[PDB]
Amino acid sequence: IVEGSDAEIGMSPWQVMLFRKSPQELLCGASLISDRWVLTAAHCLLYPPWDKNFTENDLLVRIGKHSRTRYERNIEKISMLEKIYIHPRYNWRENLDRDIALMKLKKPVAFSDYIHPVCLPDRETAASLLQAGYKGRVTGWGNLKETGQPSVLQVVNLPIVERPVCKDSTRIRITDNMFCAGYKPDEGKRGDACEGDSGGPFVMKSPFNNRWYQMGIVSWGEGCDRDGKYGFYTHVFRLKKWIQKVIDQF
Amino acid sequence: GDFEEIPEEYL
Amino acid sequence: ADCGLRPLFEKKSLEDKTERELLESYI
Ligand SMILES: COc1cc(C(=O)N2C[C@H](C)OC[C@@H]2CCO)cc2nc(N[C@H](CF)c3cccc(Cl)c3)oc12
Ligand SMILES: *[C@@H]1O[C@H](CO)[C@@H](O)[C@H](O)[C@H]1NC(C)=O
Numbered sequence: 001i002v003e004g005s006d007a008e009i010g011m012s013p014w015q016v017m018l019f020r021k022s023p024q025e026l027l028c029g030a031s032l033i034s035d036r037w038v039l040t041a042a043h044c045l046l047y048p049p050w051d052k053n054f055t056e057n058d059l060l061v062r063i064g065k066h067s068r069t070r071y072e073r074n075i076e077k078i079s080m081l082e083k084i085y086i087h088p089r090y091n092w093r094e095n096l097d098r099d100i101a102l103m104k105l106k107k108p109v110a111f112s113d114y115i116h117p118v119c120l121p122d123r124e125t126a127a128s129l130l131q132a133g134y135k136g137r138v139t140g141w142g143n144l145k146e147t148g149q150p151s152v153l154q155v156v157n158l159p160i161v162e163r164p165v166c167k168d169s170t171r172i173r174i175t176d177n178m179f180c181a182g183y184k185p186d187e188g189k190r191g192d193a194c195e196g197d198s199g200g201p202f203v204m205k206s207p208f209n210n211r212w213y214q215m216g217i218v219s220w221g222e223g224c225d226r227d228g229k230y231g232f233y234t235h236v237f238r239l240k241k242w243i244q245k246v247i248d249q250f
Numbered sequence: 251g252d253f254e255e256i257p258e259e260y261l
Numbered sequence: 262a263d264c265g266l267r268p269l270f271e272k273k274s275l276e277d278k279t280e281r282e283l284l285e286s287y288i
């Protein structure tokens with residue numbers, strides 16, 4: 001996260017770290033959506049341009065974290081993956097459309113002060129909150145600038161951007177399964193996700209029921225925190241039928 | 251060398 | 262049922278340092 005701040009303790013108890021076993025590195029962010037399901041970006045797991053095609057055994061889920069590198073004994077919980085499910089129509093070739101995956105954990109994770117799921121939006125949530133100017137929150141242990149890594153979880157609040165602005169910022173074809181967020185150059189504030197924040201959550205606090213909803217998944221950006229560029233997020237609500245399908249079947 | 255070793259049971 | 266309510270925040274009626282920024286943006 002560029003131009004964010006250190007998370008408060010327990011601020012994002014749905015934050016998950018995808019941790020590569022060998023080498024030991026941060027693979028991506030993710031989110032906890034129940035006691036056995038973790039949501040992330042497909043491209044965290046499968047991105048043949050960059051000979052990424054992790055399997056379940058390659059990664060751990062680390063939940064309850066704050067420190068990036070430290071083993072937070074009695075706080076984090078480390079979970080093994082039972083199975084990864086990548087959206088079958090994930091478009092890694094063109095534009096990361098449907099950049100979403102689910103991971104089932106071998107065992108349910110115990111909730112604690114530090115570990116707790118985020119909600120997924122329903123249509124009404126989406127339709128209320130996913131409005132240009134409405135800010136969400138992105139969190140991650142990714143780089144602090146494009147070109148360095150944080151001691152702890154970083155947080156940044158970023159406004160959703162009007163779709164034509166998103167589209168005009170890039171040559172890539174933006175789909176209805178994406179939205180973008182970030183400040184405009186005129187806007188003076190900054191912030192973005194950056195390498196290793198992929199797969200983590202863009203969340204919004206519903207003013208109707210005071211719950212956090214994960215509205216987006218950190219997907220991609222052209223660099224980090226560049227003027228006139230925006231972060232692109234998977235539209236969770238648009239893909240929730242697939243989510244529900246997977247969770248319902250498996 | 252960045253990350254503190256995980257308890258061996260998780261690997 | 263309990264999703265999206267944080268033990269150290271919503272569950273205790275404590276706000277974090279910037280969530281007001283979000284609420285203020287839900288104009
Ligand atoms: C394969 O995953 C990616 C790809 C790219 C890329 O360069 N792309 C993807 C594009 C479709 O098409 C353009 C180009 C194609 C390169 O293979 C950029 C990426 N940025 C990230 N994540 C970083 C955080 F870790 C990020 C940075 C700022 C904002 C956000 Cl929301 C996220 O993942 C990226
Ligand atoms: C990813 O790995 C699985 C098993 O390793 C394989 O069946 C699949 O074809 C692979 N996909 C790639 C390299 O794109």
